[PDB]
Amino acid sequence: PQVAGLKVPPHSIEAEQSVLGGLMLDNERWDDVAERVVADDFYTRPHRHIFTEMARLQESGSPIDLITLAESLERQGQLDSVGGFAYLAELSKNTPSAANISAYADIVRERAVVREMISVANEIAEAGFDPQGRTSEDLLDLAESRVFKIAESRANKDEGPKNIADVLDATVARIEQLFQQPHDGVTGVNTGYDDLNKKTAGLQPSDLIIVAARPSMGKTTFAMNLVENAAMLQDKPVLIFSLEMPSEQIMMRSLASLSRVDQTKIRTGQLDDEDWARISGTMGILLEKRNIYIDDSSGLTPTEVRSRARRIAREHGGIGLIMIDYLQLMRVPALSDNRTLEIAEISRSLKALAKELNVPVVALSQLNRSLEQRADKRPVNSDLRESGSIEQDADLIMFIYRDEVYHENSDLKGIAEIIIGKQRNGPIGTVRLTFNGQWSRFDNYAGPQY
Amino acid sequence: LKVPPHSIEAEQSVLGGLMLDNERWDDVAERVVADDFYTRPHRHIFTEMARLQESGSPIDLITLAESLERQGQLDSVGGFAYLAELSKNTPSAANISAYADIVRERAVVREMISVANEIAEAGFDPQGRTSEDLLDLAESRVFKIAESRANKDEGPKNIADVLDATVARIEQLFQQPHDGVTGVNTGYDDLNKKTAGLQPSDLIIVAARPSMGKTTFAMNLVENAAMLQDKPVLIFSLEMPSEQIMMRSLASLSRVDQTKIRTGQLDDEDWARISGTMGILLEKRNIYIDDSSGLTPTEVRSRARRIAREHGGIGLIMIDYLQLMRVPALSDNRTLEIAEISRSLKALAKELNVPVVALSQLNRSLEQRADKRPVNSDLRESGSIEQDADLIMFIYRDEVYHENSDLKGIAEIIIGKQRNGPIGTVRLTFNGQWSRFDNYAGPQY
Amino acid sequence: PQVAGLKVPPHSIEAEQSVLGGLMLDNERWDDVAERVVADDFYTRPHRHIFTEMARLQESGSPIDLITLAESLERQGQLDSVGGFAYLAELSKNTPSAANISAYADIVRERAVVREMISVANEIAEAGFDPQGRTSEDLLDLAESRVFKIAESRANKDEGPKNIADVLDATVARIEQLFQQPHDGVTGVNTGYDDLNKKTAGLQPSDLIIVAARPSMGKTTFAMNLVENAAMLQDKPVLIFSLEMPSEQIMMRSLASLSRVDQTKIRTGQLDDEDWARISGTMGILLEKRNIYIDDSSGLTPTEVRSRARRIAREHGGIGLIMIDYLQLMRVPALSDNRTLEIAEISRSLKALAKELNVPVVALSQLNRSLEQRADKRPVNSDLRESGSIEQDADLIMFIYRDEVYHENSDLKGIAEIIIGKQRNGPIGTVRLTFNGQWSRFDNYAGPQY
Amino acid sequence: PVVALSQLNRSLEQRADKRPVNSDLRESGSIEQDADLIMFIYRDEVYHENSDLKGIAEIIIGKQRNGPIGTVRLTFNGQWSRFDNYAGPQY
Numbered sequence A, C: 001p002q003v004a005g006l007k008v009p010p011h012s013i014e015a016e017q018s019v020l021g022g023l024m025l026d027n028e029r030w031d032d033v034a035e036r037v038v039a040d041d042f043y044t045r046p047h048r049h050i051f052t053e054m055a056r057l058q059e060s061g062s063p064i065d066l067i068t069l070a071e072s073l074e075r076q077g078q079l080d081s082v083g084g085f086a087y088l089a090e091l092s093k094n095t096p097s098a099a100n101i102s103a104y105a106d107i108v109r110e111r112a113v114v115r116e117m118i119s120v121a122n123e124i125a126e127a128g129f130d131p132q133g134r135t136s137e138d139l140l141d142l143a144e145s146r147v148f149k150i151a152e153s154r155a156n157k158d159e160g161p162k163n164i165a166d167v168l169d170a171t172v173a174r175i176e177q178l179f180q181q182p183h184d185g186v187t188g189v190n191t192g193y194d195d196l197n198k199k200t201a202g203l204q205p206s207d208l209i210i211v212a213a214r215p216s217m218g219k220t221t222f223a224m225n226l227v228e229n230a231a232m233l234q235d236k237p238v239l240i241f242s243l244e245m246p247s248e249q250i251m252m253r254s255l256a257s258l259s260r261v262d263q264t265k266i267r268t269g270q271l272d273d274e275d276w277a278r279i280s281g282t283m284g285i286l287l288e289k290r291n292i293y294i295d296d297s298s299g300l301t302p303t304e305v306r307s308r309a310r311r312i313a314r315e316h317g318g319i320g321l322i323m324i325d326y327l328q329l330m331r332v333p334a335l336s337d338n339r340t341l342e343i344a345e346i347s348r349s350l351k352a353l354a355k356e357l358n359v360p361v362v363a364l365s366q367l368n369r370s371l372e373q374r375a376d377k378r379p380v381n382s383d384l385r386e387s388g389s390i391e392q393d394a395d396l397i398m399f400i401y402r403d404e405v406y407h408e409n410s411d412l413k414g415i416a417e418i419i420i421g422k423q424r425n426g427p428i429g430t431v432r433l434t435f436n437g438q439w440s441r442f443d444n445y446a447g448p449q450y
Numbered sequence B: 001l002k003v004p005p006h007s008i009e010a011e012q013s014v015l016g017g018l019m020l021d022n023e024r025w026d027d028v029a030e031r032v033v034a035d036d037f038y039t040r041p042h043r044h045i046f047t048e049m050a051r052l053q054e055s056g057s058p059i060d061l062i063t064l065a066e067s068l069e070r071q072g073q074l075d076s077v078g079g080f081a082y083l084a085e086l087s088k089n090t091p092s093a094a095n096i097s098a099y100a101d102i103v104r105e106r107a108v109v110r111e112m113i114s115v116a117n118e119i120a121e122a123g124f125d126p127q128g129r130t131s132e133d134l135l136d137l138a139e140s141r142v143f144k145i146a147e148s149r150a151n152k153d154e155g156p157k158n159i160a161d162v163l164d165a166t167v168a169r170i171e172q173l174f175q176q177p178h179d180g181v182t183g184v185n186t187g188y189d190d191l192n193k194k195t196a197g198l199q200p201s202d203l204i205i206v207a208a209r210p211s212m213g214k215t216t217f218a219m220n221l222v223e224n225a226a227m228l229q230d231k232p233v234l235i236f237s238l239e240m241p242s243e244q245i246m247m248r249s250l251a252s253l254s255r256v257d258q259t260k261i262r263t264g265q266l267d268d269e270d271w272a273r274i275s276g277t278m279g280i281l282l283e284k285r286n287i288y289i290d291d292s293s294g295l296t297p298t299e300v301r302s303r304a305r306r307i308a309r310e311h312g313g314i315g316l317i318m319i320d321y322l323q324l325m326r327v328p329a330l331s332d333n334r335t336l337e338i339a340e341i342s343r344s345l346k347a348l349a350k351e352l353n354v355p356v357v358a359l360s361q362l363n364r365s366l367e368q369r370a371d372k373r374p375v376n377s378d379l380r381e382s383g384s385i386e387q388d389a390d391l392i393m394f395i396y397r398d399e400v401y402h403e404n405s406d407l408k409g410i411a412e413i414i415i416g417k418q419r420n421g422p423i424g425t426v427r428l429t430f431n432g433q434w435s436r437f438d439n440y441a442g443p444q445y
Numbered sequence D: 001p002v003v004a005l006s007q008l009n010r011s012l013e014q015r016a017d018k019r020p021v022n023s024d025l026r027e028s029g030s031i032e033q034d035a036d037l038i039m040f041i042y043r044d045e046v047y048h049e050n051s052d053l054k055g056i057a058e059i060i061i062g063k064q065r066n067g068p069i070g071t072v073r074l075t076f077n078g079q080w081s082r083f084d085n086y087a088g089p090q091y
């Protein structure tokens, strides 16, 4: 009957059956499950054992679907204790589609934690009635312990609140490591532009830089210049998620910058021996390193972006930089109707990413026309209208004003000034850069002052 | 075999030995309170006799009976015969302290089992609550007994039991110098007077358009309250990691600009301040920091409980750029998200007897006003925090929105809400390269 | 075999042991169980009589566990007669969690109905075949009364529908008891504001008052003044649920208001002898009385509010006032997905409480900030957006406006007006009061008409 | 072989194209897993009038265990309930 079954401890075996075989079908969602779920949150011995195997093996063994699991279990030699491969095959039979997993990873936690807490309550009571030579303070410190042990068994790392001295020693090691080598003016990533390295103090390793201007001001060119220089200097990856334009134009413009010959003398082939030599030079010095990876997709969400980036992270080493062109595309199905909160959540998640990996971010944007009808037309932070979320999240913003698009009579055609709208860890101001942009590159401007 | 453990002749013994010796009253009262006992009549006896020991000394048999008649309560305690049974029996000696002690012990136990059973109830019939919103309940209810010393975790409170704590509060400060302060000192001799210190149950909110160093101000607060006070503090930087936080606070102390530190070059003049503040900070270990990515309020509560379980009790908190906080279940709608956040914050602070400091942000419908001082109706996040809070401090600083304006190197603290006091406005300075506001010793505003 | 297991009347015995095992192990639940179960709902006579004692004691003698029960059970001569002490120990030995009771008392009621219906069906049929020379008129009224006796066995004796004449006797007795004594215009509770009792006839005793405003008008002060006054104007308790802020501030405020001194002379300590005199007076008047009870809780539900209140009601006297502060914090978690239904639930439940005890209920609120864009700002029934159920349940609503926040050039300084906006018994109006908040109290205003 | 007809949730409706797929079949995968062949169906005379597919029926196949997937065209003359083959432009 049910009355004899009512004393049962809550357990949801059905989803617990589904989840294992669902991950046997796919090892791509495995991290989001490993975080949210732990062994003891499985009810019985065998499922728990199988998840133990499937969790330890991905530290070393990539292939865990059906049979390398048998190789593992052989190296443990615990055949026919969970039924071995017999009941394992009975399990691997199940959920041959396994579309999604999240709720089936959450209800486990619900039932597991509830069961555990209630066992604890039972213990507290029946201990209070059978005290066994004990007194209140000792009677109750155990209660503190058994209550706070639960979530402590689920926390994973020292992610918790850092004592002061640890972060202190970390920062002091940074100061010392920097004190060894020359100052360089930089405390992070270099951009090449020495005049910019001062104000910015170098692109810092934990931030969400933003760059912005109307379309034909060529912000995209500047972003590619940044990643370009940062790739040639470092011994470390970079990444580029260009959305609007596919990659076979990206690389043409990249060679236009690196190689200082226009697109037209490349797509055609009118290039002289010196020009052939410089194209071959950029080719050969990129070939040795091969830092860049590119995803020239159509439209994306931050959730996919974290996966695509962390895959590169685990492939080799910590990354050095990221770029994102024309931010406004990156969707979110939840708020596909509204836009304000959409941009808010985008910026939020990208900040979270950049902190999750301790690496910078570039992330461009568009502006609103209305600065046209101000008659000075110089950008300010009020101009880009996205509810001003980015004006809060961002550790850095800067703008571009190429003089020649609006005015032509003026003599400063071909010069472009950067405006730094806001910076967290420094001052604001401006700089002056120059533009020989039939091959899409900026360079320094060693003129008189501004 | 099993029973909610009560002793019942110890109780009668205490009542009897308390009747004949009216003076034997503080030795008891320091150990026992009405709800500590088991039955109803003995409680009402105890509290009426307390009412009599207000002034009336003689309380054994007859004056008690007469008062208890005046409240019209005789014979609901048995009767006058059952009463005189007590003075008849138990002429015992002064083995009275340990009686009250064991009775208090039994009461603590009974309370413990009651809590455990409530936990089991809410484990079986959660009423849509998940586990996250359930461990919160459990840990709170247990912690309230474990930390607390008055061991009456839940219930209403009759008044005398409240006035005792109130007047102990009003007592302890007069002995020390009061100095206008109650709670925490910010170190700013003008703000202390408009505030009397960050009172230890209140949700403070800071609010400003970004480039104002509100982050800097809050760091300055927790810093000064880390050194003056001798209890922990917490700093949650959802805005940025701790390697920047450390440089900034250390800079604020040593009065050396950041651009010199991270550059890695500096003078003996500066080393003599760095080493010092390092050591003075290190021989306390006040601080704890968390450089997380995205937090719920429940995680905040959890971490805080574990801290105070370690040792003593915290005294200040700082949360950073509150809009990042997201309770995931209601991520689809934003207003209720903010409301639940602020609710949880308030209950946290009230639970631990602390202040809280929570930064925020503002809507840009103020810039077109052409005056640009903030006020209450400027922040549009449903106004869910305007109703929850106790203290607010907007910030304005003229040398952003103008270059030539003749208030250079000055900010100001526009207060817009005060739960226990009045409002005002204050003048402070800003030297943004070593990141510390200072007092404005000058004319008024 | 099992076939002969079908003619048995349905019953449960393990649940019947487990219930009593929990109740004997814990007294906190008797409300719920007695709100689901009655003596005859059990199977046999012993467990019936046991439940009889375990209710009839908690009527007056609260404690019922194992031996405080047996000490009464003996005096009716029933030891070693309903199972006895040795067997009765079994019930307290096993199931020492008291983990679930309510479920283990639902099914008993189910089977009890299912059995007391069938025992009636058979007893109707056999008489329908053994008519005894009866006639239908003498044969169907018994069946009526039989079927209805089932539901009568459960119903509490004093919740049914009353006749006109008894109610009318109560009414005339009320008017009589009034005319034995002056009237003062009051029909219940007094406040201290004679300007208010005329439009209100006092706080009536079975209602849901609401006191709504913008943040800084001072509603909290007003409610505290009300309960503060009704303390000394009565010989009967009160309650407060200061969900907003804890006791050590509330009592400072209350004390101060009673003694006409500012808070800033207490917590500072720069005060006079006249001061301490007026302090000790109100102190020694509060403590010779023992009316008030306070609850510095954090977050609550009506389900717990009812329990905390009824504990007070059953301990001593019947309460005569309540206050609840900053209502919005009251969680009822099942609905927290939504808010409109949440407020509807709370209002519904508080109304039901107040009427279940025949007492008033102050309860505060907040107003949405829509009025600001109107330039009149005198609040009205339309600007509170909390499902508008509070606009329906309430037998009274009294907003608060106070010009010297919005304007500062005021011809209307130190004056707070009370915009009543709804009434269920009297008429509407508007009251004019004065404010001097450095000690947080409102006062009368002997002044011009309006 | 065994034919076994079935029905579809209206969950497909709001998609603005309303051609079925496998995931449109909300049946806890109870036959998306325990099947060998599927052939969803569509007929554009239903959802839209200005669709230039008057008298068209297409056999959408979200799955075939033993072979390749596809997408196929037929006609429809429901006035006596029969399908024919399509001899027109390709697909």
Ligand SMILES: Nc1ncnc2c1ncn2[C@@H]1O[C@H](COP(=O)(O)OP(=O)(O)O)[C@@H](O)[C@H]1O
Residues within 6 Å of the ligand: A213, A214, A215, A216, A217, A218, A219, A220, A221, A437, A438, A439, A440
């Ligand atoms: N053949 C060319 N002649 C002149 N300018 C060029 C040529 N090719 C590229 N550019 C410059 O490169 C810039 C890149 O701009 P664009 O890619 O449109 O910016 P965004 O990516 O923001 O749209 C252009 O604004 C343009 O002035």
Ligand SMILES: Nc1ncnc2c1ncn2[C@@H]1O[C@H](COP(=O)(O)OP(=O)(O)O)[C@@H](O)[C@H]1O
Residues within 6 Å of the ligand: A423, A424, A425, A426, A427, A428, B209, B210, B211, B212, B213, B214, B215, B216, B257, B258, B259, B432, B433, B434, B435
């Ligand atoms: N080293 C520095 N040199 C010059 N200005 C600085 C320096 N550090 C900070 N600032 C200024 O101080 C302000 C601090 O703002 P911040 O602390 O980020 O508060 P918020 O997070 O609200 O912007 C910035 O506007 C910045 O311009």
Ligand SMILES: Nc1ncnc2c1ncn2[C@@H]1O[C@H](COP(=O)(O)OP(=O)(O)O)[C@@H](O)[C@H]1O
Residues within 6 Å of the ligand: B418, B419, B420, B421, B422, C214, C215, C216, C217, C218, C219, C220, C221, C263, C264, C437, C438, C439, C440
């Ligand atoms: N100690 C004080 N001195 C001067 N004014 C005060 C003091 N305490 C409170 N006030 C004023 O009186 C008001 C009290 O109302 P309050 O309790 O804040 O109502 P609410 O809970 O609705 O905010 C405050 O808003 C404040 O303006």
Ligand SMILES: [Mg+2]
Residues within 6 Å of the ligand: A220, A244, A325, A326
């Ligand atoms: Mg572009």
Ligand SMILES: [Mg+2]
Residues within 6 Å of the ligand: B214, B215, B239, B321
């Ligand atoms: Mg900040």
Ligand SMILES: [Mg+2]
Residues within 6 Å of the ligand: C220, C244, C325, C326
């Ligand atoms: Mg209030």
